[PDB]
Design a protein around this ligand. Structure first.
Ligand SMILES: C[As](C)(=O)[O-]
Ligand SMILES: C[As](C)(=O)[O-]
Ligand SMILES: C[As](C)(=O)[O-]
Ligand SMILES: [Ca+2]
Ligand SMILES: [Ca+2]
Ligand SMILES: [Ca+2]
Ligand SMILES: [Ca+2]
Ligand SMILES: [Ca+2]
Ligand SMILES: [Ca+2]
Ligand SMILES: [Ca+2]
Ligand SMILES: [Ca+2]
Ligand SMILES: [Ca+2]
Ligand SMILES: [Ca+2]
Ligand SMILES: [Ca+2]
Ligand SMILES: [Ca+2]
Ligand SMILES: [Ca+2]
Ligand SMILES: [Ca+2]
Ligand SMILES: [Ca+2]
Ligand SMILES: [Ca+2]
Ligand SMILES: [Cl-]
Ligand SMILES: [Cl-]
Ligand SMILES: [Cl-]
Lengths: 128, 130, 127, 131, 126, 131
C-alpha cells in the first residue's frame, strides 16, 4: 500500500480551528482532504506525520514637546521578533477511520498563499 | 523673583495623536499648568526648563497540536514575546513669551495610564524672567 | 523488520544530561528505552531519527519617595523565552549502537503529557 | 540666597526593595545628601527639583540539544536565549519639602547595576525656591 | 532500491545561493552531491525530504526546490540565532534535482557540528 | 545674577568614540555652548546642571554616551537592544566648573541617530549658582 501526502497552508487561521492545508502537493491514497484539513486512515498501520506552522504575531510610541504647536523636542519608545514556528513530528498506529489533523490552541497562523511556509505531511511506514 | 514651577503625572491611557493631559498635579506654583488641557501657559516671559517622561503601554503566542481523533498526540508552541514597557523622554530650555503654550503631544502609539503612580510625568520651572 | 518509536518528555532537564523521553506513544520492536532515554539498535540497518526539544525576562522599578511615599515611579523592562532546538538525521547503525538526545547546556522544558518535546525514529532499510 | 544642590552615582549593585545608596558623590552643596543612607534631607523648606536615572542590570543562558550516536554528536541544534538588555528607570519631580522631609530612590523589584565610579546610575537635585 | 542521504553544512552561506551541505554523513545510492548541494533522482518514485537551516542574524529564508521550483519555504526572523526548517514529500522523475537554496539572509557555518542539515530517502519507487 | 542656559539638538548621525556636535541650537544664553565643537565652555565659575538624551540608531546593538568634563567622565549611559530598536542613552549631572572647563557628550561605542531638525537627541544645561 502507498499512502503519502504533503500539503501547504494558503489562508490565515486563528483561534482553535483545524488547520486546513489546501495547497496539496502529494496525496497518494487520496487519504488527505483539503476541505477538512484531515488525513483519514484507510489502510490500518503505523504512520509518520510531521508539521511546520508559522505564527503571525512591534510597538512604538512617540511623545513630542510642543511650543504653540511647533515641535521643540521629539522622543520615541520602541520595542519591536514576529514570525516563529510551531513544529513537531509523531509516529502513530492508526486504525481505519482514524482522523489525524493539526489544530490551533490559541494564536494566529500565517497563511502563505502558494509559498508552502506552513506544511503538513505524512506517510505509512508499516501496514497491519 | 517670580515663582513658576509645576509637576504632574498622567492618570489615564492616551493614544494616537492627542495632547497628553497630565492630571495628577503635584506642584503648580504660579498656577500656569492646566490639567484640563495638558498645557502650560506662560505668564512671566523668560527662559524655562521643561522635562517629560512618558511610559509606552506594554502588553502580553500560537499553539499548534497534532491530534488523532481530537486527542492531542503532539504539542508545539511559537512564543509571541516584544511589547515591553519603555519611555519616550526629553528635556528642553526655551524662551517663552506671555501666552505661549507648552505641552506634550503624542505622535503615534499608546501611553500607559498610570493612575496615581506617576509613571509618566511633565514638569518645568522658570530659570530667568525677561 | 518493524522498528519505530515515538516518545515525549514529561519532566524538565538541564545542563549536560541525556533527555529521557518517558511518555512513550509508540515502540515497535521495543528498542527505545524510556528509563535511559536511549534507542538501542538490534537490527543493523539505516535509520531515520528526528527530535524537537522545547527550551524553557527582566524588569526593574525605581521610585522616588518623599518620607517613604511614592512621588514618581519608573520601570526598566526587557522581557522571548520559549524556543525549539530540533533536527533530523539518517544514520547507519550496527547492533548495540545507541542513539539519544543530549543537552549541551540550558534548560529543557518539562511538558508533562502534552508532548511538547519529542523524539522519534524508524528503520528505513535493514542490513 | 540658599545654595542646595547635589549629584551622586551608584557604585554597588542593589536589588529587591531597598533604598539606593548613591555613594559616588560628586556635588553636595549644602551637605543635605547623605551617601550612607541614600537620603536627601530637607533643611531649607521650599520647592525642589530632583531627577534620577537607574540602570537595570543586564545579563547574558541558551540551550543546545544534540543527537548522539554512542556519545558522538551527529546533529546539533540550538535554541537561543537572548533579552537581558541594559535599560533605564528614570524620572524627574518638582516637590515642596518641609524641613526634615526625606527624599530618596527606592527599588520596587529587580536588580540595579553597580557602576563603580562610572556613574551610570545617578540621583541629583537642587532647590528652586526657598519658602 | 535503497536511496537515503543526510548531510551537514560546514561553511557560512549568504544571499541567494544553493546551500551546499558538504559534511555528508549518509549517502546510500550516491545520489547526493556535496559539491553542488543537490540530490539528483536516479530511481523515479516518491521521496521524503527534510531540512533545518541555522540563521546567523536581516532575516533568513531557506526554501526546498525541485528543479528550481519552490516546494517548501521557511523563515527565520532577525528582529538572533533561529532555524528555517521544513519537510516535503515529492514525486520525482529521473534527473529531477532537489536542493535547498537561500532567499536572503545568512546561514551559519557549523564546521562539523551539523547545525544545518539536509536529508532524504525514497519512500516508494515507481 | 548671571544668565547661562543652552539647549541644542543633534542633526547628523554620529558613531564610534567622537564628540556629539549638537548643532540645532534652540537656546544659547551666555554664548557658552559651541555647536562647531559640541562643547560648553565655562566662563563664570559655579555650579551647573546638565542633561542629555541621545537616541541610538535603530543598525546595531549598543550605544554609549558619556558626559565629560575636560575629557573626564562625569556621567555614563547606555542604550541597548540585543531587535535593533531605537532606545536612549540619557543622564543628568550637577557639576562645579572653573573658567575654561569644557563640558560635552562623547560617544563610547555604537551609532547615534541623526534627527535632522526633529530634536530627538538633545543636550542642555544652565548655571545654578555662580561662585
Ligand atoms: C525615531 As523615528 C522611527 O521617528 O526616526
Ligand atoms: C509599569 As507596571 C503596570 O508593570 O507597574
Ligand atoms: C555594557 As556596561 C553598562 O557594563 O559598560
Ligand atoms: Ca496545547
Ligand atoms: Ca511581540
Ligand atoms: Ca528598551
Ligand atoms: Ca529606555
Ligand atoms: Ca513628531
Ligand atoms: Ca525564535
Ligand atoms: Ca524557532
Ligand atoms: Ca553543541
Ligand atoms: Ca532571555
Ligand atoms: Ca512602586
Ligand atoms: Ca508599584
Ligand atoms: Ca519564498
Ligand atoms: Ca527589547
Ligand atoms: Ca537583531
Ligand atoms: Ca565610558
Ligand atoms: Ca566605559
Ligand atoms: Cl523656541
Ligand atoms: Cl508632595
Ligand atoms: Cl567634578
Amino acid at each position: 500500500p502507498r499512502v503519502a501526502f504533503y500539503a501547504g497552508l494558503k489562508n490565515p487561521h486563528e483561534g482553535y480551528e483545524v488547520l486546513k492545508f489546501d495547497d496539496v502537493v502529494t496525496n497518494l491514497g487520496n487519504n488527505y482532504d483539503a476541505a477538512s484539513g484531515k488525513f483519514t486512515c484507510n489502510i490500518p498501520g503505523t504512520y509518520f506525520f510531521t508539521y511546520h506552522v508559522l505564527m503571525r504575531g512591534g510597538t512604538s510610541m512617540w511623545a513630542d514637546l510642543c511650543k504653540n504647536g511647533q515641535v521643540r523636542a521629539s522622543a520615541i519608545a520602541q520595542d519591536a521578533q514576529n514570525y516563529d514556528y510551531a513544529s513537531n513530528s509523531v509516529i502513530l498506529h492508526l486504525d481505519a477511520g482514524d482522523e489525524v489533523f493539526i489544530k490551533l490552541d490559541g494564536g494566529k497562523a500565517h497563511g502563505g498563499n502558494s509559498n508552502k511556509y506552513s506544511t503538513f505531511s505524512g506517510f505509512i511506514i508499516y501496514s497491519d
